[PDB]
Ligand binder design. Structure first.
Ligand SMILES: Nc1nc2c(ncn2[C@@H]2O[C@H](COP(=O)(O)OP(=O)(O)O)[C@@H](O)[C@H]2O)c(=O)[nH]1
Ligand SMILES: [Mg+2]
Lengths: 177, 188, 185
């Protein structure tokens, strides 16, 4: 089965590494890849073959006009935010959700908290503390998942691949049902 | 031994291949889509970049703006193509995932029925009131679906053409026009 | 002279940035362009295979197959043009532009050390002072030279590259209109 999953969200949240880390199985650390490059993967979810197509996007405003050009025919979305970046989190209901809804009302949305390995990182907790800021909690992510009516709320790390695989098995299941 | 309907069996395996091939054109199609997306963005970016250097590079202002525009243009016309390919990918997906699939459903049943018939029949053979009756049931269900298959198979080869014919025409038209409006402007 | 050099250097650094950008974007263009070619080649066979085994749509499947092949056939040269362009500019950035910076960096240092001792004294010294004044002024003249050379080369290179690039693109689309129209047999 063919399944088109597109990943949206602020730039620097982890979208690109997420896809690369999942498809290759190697954190794209040390080289940072080709720009507007998309991905794909052949997987078996509950005994079924799937051709998962992964569309990466430009978070920036400058792409507000063209990022949506990828929305037609999509089966499920991944709205992402960085667990150690409250800025991206707020933007979920603030920008991404309304956009994905404007264009695709009725499509399975899955909320992803990225950079999980950092939410429990020492210096990250501290550096963040300096700016009188603090990581996003699972309850917070969960509440958001509910506010925007997302079928699932997942957290992961493209670095330690923690939670990674699951993000996509559940993505596929939201389409297969 | 087996209940062979040769003529129909062929039409069946044939539909099965046409199916595979179509799902392959279907891949490429989708993929084509992904690349068009990738170009569009790269072109959009490169457009804004060339534009910027032009604005801040007097000695090369003409050559940079020159490229900026063509890239700014190739980005738009690129959207159009992307739209059309999406329409292509989408329409055939129905033809393959709905219409064609539908028929394959009844083709399944017929084959199940054609099998339980040969099945029961064989038991009676290896063994040798209602026995004849149930033997009749099996046969009537098989012959029934046998008919259904023959009907649906012809209504499909029927729609397959009307769809593909229109879809291929448009697609070619779209990739073509994706040059008519790009030359008449990139060379204007 | 300084401060004015300071400015011309601040500018250099930026120009570097913007070009390193165009380099990236270009690499991208090579990559996606490429992919599009692999896809067209594949779609081209698929349509050819279908057309050969589908007398119902033999034609419409047929011309679509040729078109994809033509596009691919002359998309491969377009890729050669872009590769060259990317390649060229990489040399302008990776070496020429980079060379200049190597001098700029040394020059900045020299100036710092110099301004330093000049102060640490206005409050070995003299013999080392002139030596310093000596290094600094030398480099200061060097920078001026590199900065001049780099600017001139930046133009000789880009004017050709940009133009070549742009012709390749126009060659592409135009090269197609013909063979496309031709197909309209
Ligand atoms: N620790 C950690 N850092 C990450 C992770 N994912 C991405 N990053 C970093 O986040 C930055 C942006 O990643 P990238 O995928 O290019 O961002 P995006 O493409 O805008 O989504 C990079 O510097 C990455 O190294 C992760 O899961 N764990
Ligand atoms: Mg990215």
């Amino acid at each position: 089965q063919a399944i088109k999953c597109v990943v949206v969200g602020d730039g620097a949240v982890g979208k690109t590494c997420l896809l690369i880390s999942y498809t290759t199985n190697a954190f794209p650390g040390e080289y940072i890849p080709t720009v507007f490059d998309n991905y794909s993967a052949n997987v078996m979810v509950d005994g079924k073959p799937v051709n998962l197509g992964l569309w990466d996007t430009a978070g920036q405003e400058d792409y507000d006009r063209l990022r949506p050009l990828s929305y037609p025919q999509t089966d499920v979305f991944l709205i992402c935010f960085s667990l150690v970046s409250p800025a991206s989190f707020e933007n979920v209901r603030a920008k991404w959700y309304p956009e994905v809804r404007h264009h695709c009302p009725n499509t399975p949305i899955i909320l992803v908290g990225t950079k999980l390995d950092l939410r429990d990182d020492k210096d990250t907790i501290e550096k963040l503390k300096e700016k009188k800021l603090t990581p996003i909690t699972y309850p917070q992510g969960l509440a958001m998942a509910k506010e925007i009516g997302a079928v699932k709320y997942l957290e992961c790390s493209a670095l330690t691949q923690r939670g990674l695989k699951t993000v996509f098995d559940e993505a596929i299941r939201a389409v297969l049902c | 031994s087996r209940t062979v309907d040769l003529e129909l069996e062929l039409q069946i395996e044939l539909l099965r291949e046409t199916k595979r091939k179509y799902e392959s054109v279907l891949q490429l199609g989708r993929a084509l889509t992904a690349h068009l997306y990738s170009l569009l963005q790269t072109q959009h970016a490169l457009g804004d970049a060339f534009a910027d250097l032009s604005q801040k590079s007097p000695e090369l202002q003409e050559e940079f703006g020159y490229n900026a525009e063509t890239q700014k243009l190739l980005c738009k016309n690129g959207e159009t193509l992307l739209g059309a390919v999406n329409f292509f990918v989408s329409s055939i997906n129905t033809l393959v995932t709905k219409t064609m699939e539908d028929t394959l459903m009844t083709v399944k049943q017929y084959e199940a029925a054609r099998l339980e018939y040969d099945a029961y029949r064989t038991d009676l053979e290896e063994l040798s009131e209602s026995a004849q009756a149930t033997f009749q049931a099996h046969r009537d269900k098989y012959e029934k679906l046998r008919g259904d298959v023959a009907i649906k198979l012809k209504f499909l080869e029927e729609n397959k053409i009307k769809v593909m014919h229109k879809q291929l025409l448009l697609f070619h038209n779209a990739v073509s026009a994706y040059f008519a409006g790009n030359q008449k402007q990139l060379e204007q």
